[PDB]
Design a protein around this ligand. Structure first.
Ligand code: PRO
Length: 710
């Protein structure tokens, strides 16, 4: 029969909970405890069968070698100036973590400023956030170990790259902002909690507070500047205005792009920062987002979505704060989303728009908002930018599906502006001209036209014979734009596959209306959109059900897992990374309470009724037809993923193996791989990234029996 046997997993049939009258059984509830011998044994047993399966066919080694070769290309970030020096991140190619360099001039020799690689043998300690003092002489940086969201903030004196004694603990989802007097830095921290705080715990994160750390002191001396004891879920991030006069507090609750905005005129403090600041509650509700751009005196420019779904720029004068008095600096565009805006060279605004899922970059006048210059870009994404108000030049990084980055530079002091190539890297082995990217719009179930990028070798016959890899996310106002992925291109070139990315609802591709189209009561829209994408690829002849692989991560993991339950006949392989699988209990762990803005919460009868319909953990069912089985599935998670606690995947795989894996007609494998010293994904070292993609494509290869193409 099969080559391996699924592990014995105890079913606690007494675990029954009542959700507003509906009895729900959770037989693997015990997997919620990561510290138990039972759970440890479970993980060990699952990995024991997954690893040999993935490593059996030599195609994995072929893929790993090719990935190690092709991924070995110089990787730079935009240069950015702080004080009298320039900084930039650079990875020579295969370093586990990118290194931060410093140079005293653009033509000067660069030296290593911060090398995270020497902090661990395996590169599992990574930089997570940083902040330079206004004068650029001091530097704060966060470090996370094993992929955890938890951070320890450390400090350095820039001149000489001197280590300082200051260390801040209990930092997570924190701001980092220095006051311009150079005395200290604002940051967020959570209260002491029982148990561990290393990324392996599941404990809910509440009561985050805003503190001020004076350089040269112990964290126990830190000043508490803002706290919301009556609102446990609020999170207040601080930033200083460009002139350093005001502390702007952005309070968020949940993941919607909205925030309260309070301010503190530092000059009005009785005796400096000594306790809870004299906050003026400018915007004291969660009805809209207000993202600070710059200010001229009391006139503050904010990027907002207040009655502007595609976003716009408005000016609020603190001296005449009523909404009826706000000035619209740059009106909302009928369809293009204003993604972000930066102020540079005092009176210039850099605006980045998303037009049909492709970026555009424009320069505008701060005083009038009028368009001054269009920066030419090919089809793709702007994924990096540098240029603060006092800077006189900008750098920006562009990427696409077929090419790594091109970093451009533009000296804004020249009357005739014209960006110039500053850095460009070419991957030897992947000739971009051999492939093509197309964008099509397909109708979903309800008729809504959804965009989808498709990348493939030029001149293929659309006869349905090609394996395909369809990616999707769908939620949280996140736009899935073009990105350079050598791993995916190896699938195209060496596995003869077709790549597709569906910009389903719930994302931010078409503004807040697109986001609202895939949340709460309408979450099913996401799944319908994605299923329709698969149907489009099949109908048009790009692939066939048995040769189609779907992939998503986190909320995207929820996407592909649900699609496997709803339309098992439509896919051949499903790879769900760090997915949210238990939609009834997600809100109980770590930062999960924040996702209720997209999903709702089971505590509500109304929400429960939406959730129970698509929750992956609660919708595993044998297909009715004798000729339909579940697709091959691979769940990927890690023991320090404190963003989406691994229990989601643990309970889901147990359920799949028991309900579906035991069926005689099920021949496709249902596996999970739980990595160690890793988390959700941010900061994952190069070595691990390579192993992961090798596991993914090896799985696809074995399940669909795809031959390697040298
Ligand atoms: O998608 C992610 O990365 C997690 C889970 C949904 C919200 N944030």
């Amino acid at each position: 029969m099969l080559s391996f046997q699924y592990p014995d997993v105890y079913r606690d049939e007494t675990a029954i909970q009542d959700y507003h009258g509906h009895k729900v059984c959770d037989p693997y509830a015990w997997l919620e405890d990561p510290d138990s011998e039972q759970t440890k044994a479970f993980v060990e047993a699952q990995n024991k069968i997954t690893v040999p399966f993935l490593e059996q066919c030599p195609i994995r080694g072929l893929y790993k070698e090719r990935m190690t070769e092709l991924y070995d290309y110089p990787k730079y970030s935009c240069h950015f100036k702080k004080g009298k020096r320039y900084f930039y991140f650079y990875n020579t190619g295969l370093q586990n973590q990118r290194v931060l360099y410093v140079q005293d001039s653009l033509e000067g020799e660069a030296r290593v400023f911060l090398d995270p690689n020497i902090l661990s043998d395996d590169g599992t300690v990574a930089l997570r956030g940083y902040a330079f003092s206004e004068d650029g002489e001091y530097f704060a940086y966060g470090l996370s170990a094993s992929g955890s969201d938890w951070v320890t903030i450390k400090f350095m004196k820039v001149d000489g790259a001197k280590e300082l004694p200051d260390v801040l603990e209990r930092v997570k989802f924190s701001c980092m902002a220095w006051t311009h007097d150079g005395k200290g830095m604002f940051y967020n921290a959570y209260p002491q909690q029982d148990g561990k705080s290393d990324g392996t715990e599941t404990s809910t994160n509440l009561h985050q507070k805003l503190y001020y750390h004076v350089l040269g002191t112990d964290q126990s001396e830190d000043i508490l500047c803002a706290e919301f004891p009556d609102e446990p879920k609020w999170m207040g991030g601080a930033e200083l205005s460009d002139d350093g006069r005001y502390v702007l507090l952005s309070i968020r609750e949940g993941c919607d792009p909205v925030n309260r905005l309070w301010y503190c005129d530092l000059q009005q403090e009785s005796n400096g920062i000594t306790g809870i600041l004299k906050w003026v509650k400018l915007i004291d509700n969660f009805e809209g987002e207000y993202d600070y751009v710059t200010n001229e005196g009391t006139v503050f420019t904010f990027k907002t979505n207040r009655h502007s779904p595609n976003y716009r720029l408005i000016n609020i004068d603190f001296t005449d704060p009523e909404e009826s008095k706000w000035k619209v600096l740059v009106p909302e565009h009928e369809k293009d989303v204003l993604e972000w805006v930066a102020c540079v060279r005092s009176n210039f605004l850099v605006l980045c728009y998303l037009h049909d899922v492709k970026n555009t970059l424009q320069l505008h006048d701060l005083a009038t908002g009028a368009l001054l210059k269009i920066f030419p870009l090919e089809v793709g994404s702007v994924v990096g930018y540098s240029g603060q108000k006092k800077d006189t030049e900008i750098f920006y990084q562009f990427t696409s599906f077929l090419s790594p980055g091109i970093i451009y530079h533009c000296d804004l002091t020249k009357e005739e502006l014209e960006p110039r190539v500053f850095r460009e890297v070419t991957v030897k082995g992947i000739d971009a001209s051999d492939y093509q990217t197309v964008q099509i719009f397909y109708p979903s179930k309800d008729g809504t036209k959804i965009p989808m990028f498709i990348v493939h070798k030029k001149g293929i016959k659309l006869d349905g014979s090609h394996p395909a890899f369809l990616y999707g996310y769908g939620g949280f106002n996140i736009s899935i734009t073009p990105n350079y992925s050598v791993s995916r291109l190896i699938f195209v070139r060496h596995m003869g596959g077709v790549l597709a990315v569906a910009n389903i609802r719930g994302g931010g591709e078409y503004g807040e209306t697109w986001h609202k189209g895939g949340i709460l009561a309408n979450k099913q829209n996401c799944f319908d959109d994605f299923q329709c994408a698969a149907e489009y690829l099949i109908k048009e002849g790009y692939t066939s059900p048995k040769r189609l692989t779907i992939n998503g991560g986190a909320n995207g993991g929820l996407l592909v897992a649900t699609c496997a339950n709803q339309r098992p006949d439509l896919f051949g392989c499903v790879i769900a990374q760090v997915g949210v699988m238990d939609m009834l209990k997600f809100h109980k762990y770590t930062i999960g309470h924040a996702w209720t803005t997209d999903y709702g919460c089971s505590d509500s009868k109304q929400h429960f009724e939406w959730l129970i319909k698509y929750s992956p953990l609660h919708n595993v069912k044998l297909p009715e037809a004798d000729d339909i089985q579940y697709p091959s599935m691979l769940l990927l998670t890690a023991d320090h993923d404190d963003r989406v606690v691994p229990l989601h995947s643990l309970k889901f795989i147990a359920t799949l193996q028991y309900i579906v894996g035991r069926s005689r007609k099920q021949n496709n494998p249902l596996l999970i791989h739980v990595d160690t010293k890793a988390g959700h994904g941010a900061g994952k070292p190069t070595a691990k990234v390579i192993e992961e993609v090798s596991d993914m494509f090896a799985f696809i290869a074995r399940c669909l029996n795809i031959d390697w193409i040298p």
